[PDB]
């Protein structure tokens, strides 16, 4: 049969706990478990997997979870909750797409994952981005890593290999 069990960290950054559970168990155990240890109450806490607010009634095969995946615990928010916003302001007007991390389990090649450690706010040159997307031909998905200090990484994966683009952000 398949794996039938997987391990997941659960962290708030100073305190983490690992668990192994069937891929069919509601996460309530782990969320109550982490919560008891924390002193804090079960529902005084916001829980997200890769940017996605999850709720105790949900299973790992639902979120299409990997081995070694992480759930993060935050104090109650706004909210319900992280987002990516792309914006351009030009001469003629302006544009603004907001996308939310989500996982569709029926077909998950489509989903949107987000490890945010620090929030970032960066600008790039659309001429360069326009060439970078020419690698969409190589890969179903694109991986983007953003550093407020280093150039950004845009990665397209092949079967044993990759095409990477490192692009310096603008200043002003």
């Amino acid at each position: 049969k398949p794996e039938t069990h997987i391990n997941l960290k659960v962290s708030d950054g100073s305190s983490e706990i690992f668990f192994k559970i069937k891929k069919t168990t509601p996460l309530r155990r782990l969320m109550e478990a982490f919560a008891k240890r924390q002193g804090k109450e079960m529902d005084s806490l916001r829980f997200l997997y890769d940017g996605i607010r999850i709720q105790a009634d949900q299973t790992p095969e639902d979120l299409d979870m990997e081995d070694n995946d992480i759930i993060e615990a935050h104090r109650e928010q706004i909210g319900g909750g992280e987002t990516i916003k792309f914006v351009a302001d030009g001469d003629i007007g302006s544009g603004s797409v907001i996308i939310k991390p989500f996982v569709d389990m029926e077909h998950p090649e489509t989903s949107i994952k987000l490890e945010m450690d620090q929030p970032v706010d960066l600008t790039f040159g659309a001429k360069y981005l326009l060439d970078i997307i020419k690698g969409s031909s190589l890969s179903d998905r694109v991986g983007i890593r953003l550093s407020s200090e280093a150039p950004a990484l845009f990665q397209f994966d092949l079967k044993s290999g990759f095409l990477q683009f490192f692009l310096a952000p603008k200043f002003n």
Binding site: I84, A88, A126, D131, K170
Partner: protein, 163 residues
């Protein structure tokens, strides 16, 4: 000699197309364990890093480290050659002045062989350094493509904001 054979001629074409648009002359370095390429564009704001492991060729062999410098325009003219379903094989004998691209169709029927004169190209100096990043997201490349293409209409600058 170097001898690297792709299952799909389409793969290599599709990889060159991935970046023939920002850098134009690139040195491909062949090794015992695969091929890599780095190049910076002219503005020197964009670095392109290619790596193809051994598990992407159906058959890979590289006796000695060799470096082939290619004009990516020249190269993609030749990559428009044959059926793009076909077995494409690169071949260079060591200390090379040309590279050979050899298309063959499954049946012994046709066999197109191209030779490309090589370039002399300076290595620049860049090395890369990974460092962790504040944020990491992954999404469909078709979606990101649409976003960029669309917002491209309005400004010369796109800004990303995660919170």
């Amino acid at each position: 000699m170097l001898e690297a054979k792709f299952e799909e001629a389409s793969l290599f074409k599709r990889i060159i197309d991935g970046f023939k648009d920002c850098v134009q002359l690139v040195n491909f370095q062949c090794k015992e364990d695969g091929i890599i390429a780095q190049a910076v564009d002219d503005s020197r704001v964009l670095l392109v890093s290619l790596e193809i492991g051994v598990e992407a060729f159906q058959e890979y062999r590289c006796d000695h480290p060799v470096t082939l410098g290619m004009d990516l325009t020249s190269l993609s003219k030749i990559l428009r050659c044959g059926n793009n379903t076909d077995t494409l094989t690169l071949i260079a004998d060591n200390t090379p002045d040309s590279i050979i691209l050899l298309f063959e169709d499954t049946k012994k029927d046709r066999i197109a062989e191209y030779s490309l004169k090589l370039m002399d190209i300076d290595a620049d100096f860049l090395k890369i350094e990974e460092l962790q990043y504040d944020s990491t997201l992954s999404l469909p490349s078709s979606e990101f493509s649409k976003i960029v293409r669309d917002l491209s209409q309005l400004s010369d600058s796109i800004n990303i904001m995660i919170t």
